[PDB]
Amino acid sequence: MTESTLAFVFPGQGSQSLGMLAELSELHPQIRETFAEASEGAGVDLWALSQGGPEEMLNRTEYTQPALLAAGVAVWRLWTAQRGQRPALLAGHSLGEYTALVAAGVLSLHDGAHLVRLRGQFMQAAAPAGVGAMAAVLGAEDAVVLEVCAEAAGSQVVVPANFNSPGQIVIGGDAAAVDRALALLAERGVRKAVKLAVSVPSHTPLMRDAANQLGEAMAGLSWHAPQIPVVQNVDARVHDGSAAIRQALVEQLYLPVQWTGCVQALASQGITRIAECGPGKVLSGLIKRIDKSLDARPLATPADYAGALDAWAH
Numbered sequence: 001m002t003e004s005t006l007a008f009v010f011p012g013q014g015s016q017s018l019g020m021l022a023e024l025s026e027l028h029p030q031i032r033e034t035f036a037e038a039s040e041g042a043g044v045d046l047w048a049l050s051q052g053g054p055e056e057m058l059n060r061t062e063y064t065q066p067a068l069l070a071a072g073v074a075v076w077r078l079w080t081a082q083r084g085q086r087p088a089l090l091a092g093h094s095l096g097e098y099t100a101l102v103a104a105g106v107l108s109l110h111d112g113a114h115l116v117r118l119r120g121q122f123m124q125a126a127a128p129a130g131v132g133a134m135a136a137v138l139g140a141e142d143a144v145v146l147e148v149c150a151e152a153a154g155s156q157v158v159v160p161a162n163f164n165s166p167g168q169i170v171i172g173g174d175a176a177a178v179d180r181a182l183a184l185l186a187e188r189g190v191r192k193a194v195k196l197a198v199s200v201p202s203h204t205p206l207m208r209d210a211a212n213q214l215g216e217a218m219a220g221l222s223w224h225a226p227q228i229p230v231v232q233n234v235d236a237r238v239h240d241g242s243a244a245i246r247q248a249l250v251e252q253l254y255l256p257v258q259w260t261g262c263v264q265a266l267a268s269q270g271i272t273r274i275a276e277c278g279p280g281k282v283l284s285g286l287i288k289r290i291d292k293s294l295d296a297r298p299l300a301t302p303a304d305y306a307g308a309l310d311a312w313a314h
Contacts, residue, residue, distance in 0.1 A: 002228075003085035006312065007271045009263075009287070010072040010092030010099035013198065015280035016064050018055050021071055023302050030081065031074045034109065038070035041113030046070045061200050062120030065095045066113040072099035072278035073109055075299050079277065085314045089238075089271060091231040091262045093283060094162075094202060095119075097252065103277070104226035106245065111221050118217045122210035123200045123253070132201030133178040137185060138192035139167045148188070152181035161203035162257040165289035172201040203256050211253040218246050236261030259283075263290045275299050275308055 025031040035047035046067045049058050057063050072092070076099075080086070090100040095116060102112040137145050142163070149158045149171055157173035158181045164170060171181055178195070185193050201207070223242040231238055234251045236258045263286070266274065276284045276298040287296040297308040 001086065002088050003273075003312075003314065004088045004270055005272045006085050006087045007089045007091065007266045007274045008076070008087040008100075008103065008277045009090070009274055009283045010096035010103070011276060011278040011280055011283055012068060012093040012095035013061060013064055013202070014196075015278065015282050016050070016058060016068055016071075017279060018051070018053055018058065020050055020279035021074060021300070022051060024075070024078070024300075024305060027302060028078055030077055034074040034077055035070045037109050038066060038073065038113035041108075041110035042066035042070075042117045043114075044117070046113075059197070060120075060124070061198070062117055062124055065098075065116035065120040068095055068278060069099045069102065069112055069116050070109075072096065073102050073112070075277045075305075076103045078305070079275070079299065079309070082309060083314070084309055085312050087228060087275070089231055089266055089269060090228050091233075091266065093259055094233065094252070094257055096278070096283075097230065097233055097249070099278065100230045101226070101245070104228045104230055106224050106226050106230075107221065115217060115221065119214055119253075122213040122217075123202060123207060126210040127199065127201050127206050129199040131175060132172065132199060132204075132206060133175040134161060134170055134172040134196040134198050134201055135178050135182060136168060136170050136194055136196060137190065138194075140169070140185070140190045140192075142169060144188065144190065145169050145171065145185070148181050148184045152184050153177055154180070157201075157205050159204050160256045161201065163260045164257075165260055165286045167289065168286065170196070172204045173206060174201070203252075203254065205254055207254040211250045214253055215246065215250045218249065231262050231265050233257040233259065233262060236265045259286060260290050263287055263294075267291050267294060273297075273312060
């Protein structure tokens with residue numbers, strides 16, 4: 001039935017690549033069928049975009065989001081059809097939380113794809129290119145980064161946007177303020193700090209109004225009871241009922257992703273095995289840093305998929 005030790009996690013912005021899932025698609029016709037279904041909701045051919053580009057559009061968040069949602073749901077449908085063990089819990093990183101809700105049966109794939117295209121649009125409009133920035137800070141203490149953000153802000157916004165693992169925090173906000181934070185980190189000795197290519201300062205106060213727009217978009221859709229609980233990013237908790245799940249998604253947009261917290265919450269609930277259900281191996285890398293005992297495996301490629309399917313055989 002359900003495997004009590006297994007969770008699935010779904011990747012978000014940053015995990016996309018040209019040709020993602022190409023090799024799995026060659027083996028499994030369901031993959032392109034899932035993209036076609038998602039594409040109807042999104043208003044764009046997500047398979048064509050993800051395989052052929054243009055990469056510039058694929059990397060623009062209003063497109064990346066439905067593309068990655070389609071990708072995670074495609075791998076989910078493959079695993080579930082091929083008799084992989086059913087996970088007892090789900091989570092996902094930012095966009096990935098929506099992928100999790102589709103996997104849980106809360107939203108249809110059509111609606112999920114439509115919703116995250118809108119989510120990306122609202123986010124992009126909140127911070128037109130040039131306005132926002134994000135930066136990863138590696139190997140520092142959380143406290144150092146948090147005090148630096150407060151000191152750098154001035155009249156602008158710079159805040160922790162992702163708690164990704166011990167020694168990985170992403171900060172975000174106004175471009176000038178992120179740059180000031182980077183300067184202060186540099187004068188404090190913290191060198192491993194790289195500005196990300198993303199133009200959108202997700203999970204910062206600059207998304208507050210976009211979050212309200214998101215809330216209105218969500219309320220026009222049909223929400224179903226989850227078949228598998230979803231540990232949500234805003235507070236690393238499962239939320240009960242439509243109103244609470246949606247409120248946690250609204251809050252998610254302008255508050256930090258508690259990725260460390262979500263993984264710790266999974267582990268505290270008896271999870272020992274985690275599949276990364278979608279492209280890349282980013283979450284698997286974070287998980288290995290958060291809790292070295294967890295068996296974290298990507299499913300993005302034929303060999304990794306087959307390896308997981310075999311090692312966790314039911």
